[PDB]
Amino acid sequence: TPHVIQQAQARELLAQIDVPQILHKLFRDLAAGLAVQPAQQLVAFPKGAGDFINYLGVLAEDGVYGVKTSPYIVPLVTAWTLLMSMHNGQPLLLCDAHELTTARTAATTALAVDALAPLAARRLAIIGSGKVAQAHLRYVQNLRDWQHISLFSPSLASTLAQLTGLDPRLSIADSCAAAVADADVIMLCTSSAGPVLDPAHLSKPALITSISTNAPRAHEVPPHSLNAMQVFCDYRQTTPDAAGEMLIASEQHGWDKRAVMGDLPELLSDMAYQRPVFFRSIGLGLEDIALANALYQLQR
Amino acid sequence: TPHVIQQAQARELLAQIDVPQILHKLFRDLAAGLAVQPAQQLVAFPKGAGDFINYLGVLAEDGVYGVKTSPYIVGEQGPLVTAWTLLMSMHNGQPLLLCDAHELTTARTAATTALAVDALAPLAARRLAIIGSGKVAQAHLRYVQNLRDWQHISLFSPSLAPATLAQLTGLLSIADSCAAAVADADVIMLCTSSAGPVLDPAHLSKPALITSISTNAPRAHEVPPHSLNAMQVFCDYRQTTPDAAGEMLIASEQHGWDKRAVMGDLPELLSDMAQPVFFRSIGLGLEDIALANALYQLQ
Numbered sequence: 147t148p149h150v151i152q153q154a155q156a157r158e159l160l161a162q163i164d165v166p167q168i169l170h171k172l173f174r175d176l177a178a179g180l181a182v183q184p185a186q187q188l189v190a191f192p193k194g195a196g197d198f199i200n201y202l203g204v205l206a207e208d209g210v211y212g213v214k215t216s217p218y219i220v221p222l223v224t225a226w227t228l229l230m231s232m233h234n235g236q237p238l239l240l241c242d243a244h245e246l247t248t249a250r251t252a253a254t255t256a257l258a259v260d261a262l263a264p265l266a267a268r269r270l271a272i273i274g275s276g277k278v279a280q281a282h283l284r285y286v287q288n289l290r291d292w293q294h295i296s297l298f299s300p301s302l303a304s305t306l307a308q309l310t311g312l313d314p315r316l317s318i319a320d321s322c323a324a325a326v327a328d329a330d331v332i333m334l335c336t337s338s339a340g341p342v343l344d345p346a347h348l349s350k351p352a353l354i355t356s357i358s359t360n361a362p363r364a365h366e367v368p369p370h371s372l373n374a375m376q377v378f379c380d381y382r383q384t385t386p387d388a389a390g391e392m393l394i395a396s397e398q399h400g401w402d403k404r405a406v407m408g409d410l411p412e413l414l415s416d417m418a419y420q421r422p423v424f425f426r427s428i429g430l431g432l433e434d435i436a437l438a439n440a441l442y443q444l445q446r
Numbered sequence: 447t448p449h450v451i452q453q454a455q456a457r458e459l460l461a462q463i464d465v466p467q468i469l470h471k472l473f474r475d476l477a478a479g480l481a482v483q484p485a486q487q488l489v490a491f492p493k494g495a496g497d498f499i500n501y502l503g504v505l506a507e508d509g510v511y512g513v514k515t516s517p518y519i520v521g522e523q524g525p526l527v528t529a530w531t532l533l534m535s536m537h538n539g540q541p542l543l544l545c546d547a548h549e550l551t552t553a554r555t556a557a558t559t560a561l562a563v564d565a566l567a568p569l570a571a572r573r574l575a576i577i578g579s580g581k582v583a584q585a586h587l588r589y590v591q592n593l594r595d596w597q598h599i600s601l602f603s604p605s606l607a608p609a610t611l612a613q614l615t616g617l618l619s620i621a622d623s624c625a626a627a628v629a630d631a632d633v634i635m636l637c638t639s640s641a642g643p644v645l646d647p648a649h650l651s652k653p654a655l656i657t658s659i660s661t662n663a664p665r666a667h668e669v670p671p672h673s674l675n676a677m678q679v680f681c682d683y684r685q686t687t688p689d690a691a692g693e694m695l696i697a698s699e700q701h702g703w704d705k706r707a708v709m710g711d712l713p714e715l716l717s718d719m720a721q722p723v724f725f726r727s728i729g730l731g732l733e734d735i736a737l738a739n740a741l742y743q744l745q
């Protein structure tokens with residue numbers, strides 16, 4: 147120790163791990179106080195040259211804690227996780243967490259789609275076509291008897307067989323509105339700073355999920371729309387004070403956090419469709435540390 | 447890369463670097479805006495198991511940032527405390543060095559206090575007292591030895607009243623009490639692992655420079671916090687440390703002390719911008735990142 151895991155081996159090890167299962171466990175443990183989610187810290191480089199965020203997790207029950215450091219340089223974004231022992235204070239693992247991040251994000255949304263989507267859902271929209279959107283598809287393509295799956299990004303008109311080759315039910319829409327038309331579940335998987343979908347423009351109640359974080363107060367629905375949605379999120383205690391649409395809604399549209407009807411801890415320990423349903427994830431250090439730990443236990 | 451440097455190798459490379467040099471440059475560099483010193487983060491483990499502190503630094507000059515993590519694991523008769531520094535690249539966002547920072551830390555703590563003693567002690571200061579006799583006290587004694595014409599050096603810990611004879615004779619007396627050790631002292635260096643007061647600046651026979659370094663508890667402090675109201679207060683970095691240093695937090699919360707009485711920090715002292723004297727060090731990530739980066743340059 148410490149084992150140093152570069153990208154290739156990390157991906158090989160990633161493939162041998164049930165991320166949905168690991169995060170499922172992590173949330174029930176968080177619900178029971180067996181894991182602790184510390185605050186993130188963000189530090190700007192001088193002269194616009196970029197930022198870095200440190201994400202933390204304490205897995206008390208497993209006797210490990212960690213930091214993922216993610217620099218954004220000018221646009222290069224990497225991620226590395228250091229796992230430390232709570233028993234002897236020594237480093238266990240230093241792991242390239244670039245792919246681990248993508249997986250946990252999609253698997254976290256996935257857990258929320260499983261807990262929240264109505265059992266008989268048939269139509270799926272994915273907005274965004276990057277790796278996070280593809281992972282989202284990979285991790286939700288089996289959760290329901292989807293008849294139809296729609297995908298839209300701007301760039302998609304102007305490589306297309308990869309996208310349609312991830313599922314036989316997937317077709318490229320020419321517009322957001324086409325993709326989401328008649329959708330039971332809509333997964334917003336974009337880099338967008340600002341709204342990509344108004345829930346007022348829906349033909350029926352849907353489950354809407356959102357993951358965009360790359361911007362100060364980045365958000366994918368209109369902040370006012372939270373007041374018209376049944377609102378869920380990854381963690382009650384952290385996400386409302388950082389999710390852009392949630393801040394803006396509370397500062398300007400009189401939205402109160404107490405309107406949050408459940409987080410994943412509450413959903414997955416059973417403590418938590420006449421209106422649309424909104425699920426917000428912004429990423430939790432605990433997800434990063436859980437995953438790195440799973441690699442560490444696998445690496446032994 | 448990344449290189450992993452364990453304890454024994456870290457010490458050897460440490461012997462090859464000029465710590466006071468590096469910290470002098472560093473603190474001038476921080477005053478001039480060329481490096482960022484964000485606040486430390488303390489995270490409690492659940493159920494009284496302990497905590498960790500993460501120290502950050504951006505050395506934008508040398509194209510590196512990093513994080514030193516320091517777990518504090520509660521034990522039966524004393525905490526187990528470690529320190530590992532991860533140094534990252536600002537060009538490609540990859541790790542450069544994961545280094546055991548146990549001894550690096552000891553060195554940058556003593557050297558930080560030596561910078562402070564230089565800039566704050568009377569140029570005609572004669573008698574020196576050191577409270578504590580462990581690794582940190584040994585480092586202090588060896589970094590501050592040629593800063594003044596010391597005519598007497600006294601030293602106290604309750605165990606003396608091994609690896610220090612390795613520093614007794616690395617540079618003069620061992621007192622039988624705290625009081626005896628600090629009689630007529632011009633500079634008193636508190637170099638303990640104490641969580642609470644080891645010296646009351648009100649029982650001194652005359653004014654002195656009093657320095658403090660202990661971080662061996664969430665709010666460790668080596669002087670009664672109320673005493674900060676009767677002392678001219680300086681610290682390593684005024685932007686962050688007044689909000690973490692035990693005695694400053696307690697004084698502010700209960701003794702009506704206010705952080706704006708901080709008459710200077712080290713960036714200010716070593717850029718001529720500053721003004722009984724107390725100096726408080728709790729460690730700063732930049733110091734940690736600077737020293738780690740030195741070891742990385744050596745490879």
Ligand SMILES: NC(=O)c1ccc[n+]([C@@H]2O[C@H](COP(=O)([O-])OP(=O)(O)OC[C@H]3O[C@@H](n4cnc5c(N)ncnc54)[C@H](OP(=O)(O)O)[C@@H]3O)[C@@H](O)[C@H]2O)c1
Binds near residue numbers: 251
């Ligand atoms: N919540 C979390 O846990 C977490 C963690 C890390 C990252 N993230 C977020 O995940 C996002 C997706 O990551 P990625 O690697 O898949 O990124 P990416 O490769 O940059 O993909 C972004 C996608 O958003 C699409 N998009 C659709 N409508 C858009 C609109 N109106 N404005 C902007 N973009 C629009 C883009 O279309 P084009 O084809 O036209 O570009 C593109 O396909 C990141 O940008 C980040 O904010 C979330």
Ligand SMILES: NC(=O)c1ccc[n+]([C@@H]2O[C@H](COP(=O)([O-])OP(=O)(O)OC[C@H]3O[C@@H](n4cnc5c(N)ncnc54)[C@H](OP(=O)(O)O)[C@@H]3O)[C@@H](O)[C@H]2O)c1
Binds near residue numbers: 579662
């Ligand atoms: N070690 C580092 O790298 C480093 C770096 C930055 C800050 N610090 C801080 O400095 C502290 C000291 O570190 P160290 O490595 O020198 O520890 P150490 O080797 O255990 O030495 C601590 C010394 O404090 C003495 N001391 C004197 N009066 C005391 C009192 N009233 N209560 C408690 N202790 C008293 C101890 O007495 P005995 O001789 O009777 O045991 C001992 O000599 C750390 O615990 C930490 O807060 C350490």
Ligand SMILES: N[C@@H](CCCC[NH3+])C(=O)O
Binds near residue numbers: 529661662
């Ligand atoms: N290892 C050090 C702690 C490192 C943190 C320095 N600010 C100690 O014994 O207390």
